[PDB]
RNA sequence: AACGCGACGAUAACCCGCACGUAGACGUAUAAGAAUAGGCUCCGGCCUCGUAUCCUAGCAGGCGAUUCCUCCGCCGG
């Protein structure tokens, strides 16, 4: 990136390097995506979360007793 | 009337306050799952059948899922949720019949001798029991179609650690 | 002072039958709003010339905006400030994107470093160093230098002031 | 067994009355709701029913629990404290006591 | 974020004396139970001789007739130095103030019922988040030892034994995290992937 | 310390009559240490962030199944 590059040069560098793609792969955006899915959970959706975590942990408890 | 007015009790001024209908909130659509906040059915997850006049809502459980019968509740005493169960197949004519306000509103030896005694709890009417069954039979069939909706309506809402209602969405 | 603006104030003496069509003076004034820009115009003008508010009128007031408030310019401000001894000249330099940001940083600098108030500072000339190698202060030349790149050691996290207690100890590496 | 709670209220504490330095007005009471930090979060709790439950050492209605009911009227400060009005002003000894904020009346 | 807890225990290590005291005193008057742990590891800003000057000026103030009654009782322990700072921020002459001081508990070191609990920290009084890097600071434990505290070696020996028990606990905690990750990967093969697809979308 | 604390020795089980059942619980769940011009770790990697992690469905939580070896509690050793 040159110093003092205007909006045209920075836009062409963003598209060439594809920094929208590598931002999505960053651990910070995965954290930001997960926490956005927190707040979108409705009351019914939070109940299915409780039910499926119960179903998931039944296997994880079983495997831990095996280990 | 019959009596000439015996005292200086004056008739009131003509009051210009006209009764205009109550517009409910946009969330209060028929089929919306509600959360009861007060009463003996506090914390129960019910469904809304029809929005009635002056801020009250007609509500059923259904009775075979959680245990709340055909009841009226106040709109302000209810949290409305985003989940809506299909009303297809539910008799609208029976809903209009139970929406009538009289459906829920309504000296001797025996009179003296039950004084001070707790009156026995009245067993349920056969008309109300049959009216419940004619409504919930299509509701429950629609409820069974969507996964985990029946267990969701059987369960009770509760607040846990860190649950902030000013950010939670229903 | 706050969101300062820069105003062009045109004023003149009131016209007279003996002296029609007067001299029509002009000054550039850094003021928060219009009513102090007019007040600071008549303050300076009565200091230089005989013309005063009762015998004069304001011809025009127009705000002036930056040509390019999105480019970074090095600014040199010559100022004259009054202390308990007398009047002294300074040439200070600051790095901003606008002329009102130049004098905003000037008043904060002179107040912090020399305890100077607004009524003691006289903004003599504000110039934009159009070409580099005319920067003559060591702190600004330090920022102008080639392929400049610095880290940010000991960045304190922004923890909310109403979160009184926290479980994990904070880190200062971000 | 359910092994669940029955909490349909939001916890809060009774901080003090409304006051300057040397002038206190007990008709209005300052409440710190658990979780609210701003005026924007406090705005959700305006016009909500507020209860202060306590004990008696004498059964009056078959129970030893007496309740004073009120409502949250307006926010207070920048830190999320609300100020509430009760039918009878809260004692003074309850500075720091638990206060229940109900979720009704509701506009959700 | 404005949480309400039964008893909150604060690790005093790396904490400024007065800035922790003003937070604790505001919490105590709000109705929160406070337990302060490792008061000898608290920090005071400035240099050490300034703190040594200030306590010797405090040690200069005594009542004439008899120091048993009415005299300023000079406490040489780190916990009571912190207790003096909190008490000055409390209207202790009133009944509300004394009830708030009853909600406070201060200890030198980490006693056995409180080394099993989770010690929280106050970011508004931490030295590394508040003090400028070049500036000097002192420790209350070395202030108290050079003014009359006689239990510094006792506390240091008791803290050494707590680290050894803590180090063995962390190895077991490390092993339990091993077995949980091994079980989670193994149970994921038989975990009905319609469930895991829905949980991933929901955030979990 | 006469309104600070500890160890120890010996005590008060009967029978007759009668007076009453929270300076603030509501999931009152969560132990590394240490550094903060560094640290943690499956040795792959990870760290602004507790916006986390466990628990949370059932007449204030019934009865009987289908079905499951998971979690909780009491006694011992």
Question: What is shown here, in short?
Answer:
Chain A contains 4 helices and no strands. With 174 residues, chain C is α+β, with helices and mostly antiparallel strands.
Can you give a write-up of this model?
This is part of a larger assembly, with chains A (67 residues), B (170 residues), C (174 residues), D (108 residues) and E (204 residues). Chain B is an alpha+beta fold and 170 residues long. Chain B contains five helices and five strands, in the order βββββααααα. In chain B, strands 4-3-2-1-5 form a five-stranded antiparallel β-sheet. Chain C contains three helices and six strands. Chain C has helices spanning 34-48, 99-114, 138-144, and strands spanning 5-13, 25-31, 56-64, 73-82, 87-96, 121-128. In chain C, strands 2-1-3 form a three-stranded antiparallel β-sheet. A three-stranded antiparallel β-sheet of chain C has the order 5-4-6, with helices on one face. The longest helix of chain C has 16 residues, at 99-114. Chain C is elongated, with a radius of gyration of 22 Å. Chain D is mainly beta. Helix content of chain D is 4%, strand content 47%. Chain D is built from one helix and six strands; from the N terminus they run E-E-H-E-E-E-E. A six-stranded antiparallel β-barrel of chain D has the order 1-2-5-4-3-6. Chain D is globular and about 45 Å long. Chain E has eight helices and five strands. In chain E, the strands form two sheets. A three-stranded parallel β-sheet of chain E has the order 1-2-4. In chain E, strands 3-5 form a two-stranded antiparallel ribbon. With 204 residues, chain E is mainly alpha-helical. In chain E, helix 1 (17-30) links the parallel strand 1 and strand 2. Chains in contact: A-B, A-E, B-D, C-D, C-E, D-E. The interface between B and D is medium-sized, with 22 and 20 residues. Chain E binds one RNA strand of 77 nucleotides through residues 1, 3-7, 14, 31, 68, 95-96, 98-100, 102-103, 110, 114-119, 128-129, 133, 162-163, 166-171, 173-174, 177-178, 181-182. Chain D: This is 60S ribosomal protein l33-like protein. Chain D: Belongs to the eukaryotic ribosomal protein eL33 family. Chain D: Pfam families: Ribosomal_L35Ae. Chain D: GO terms for molecular function: structural constituent of ribosome.
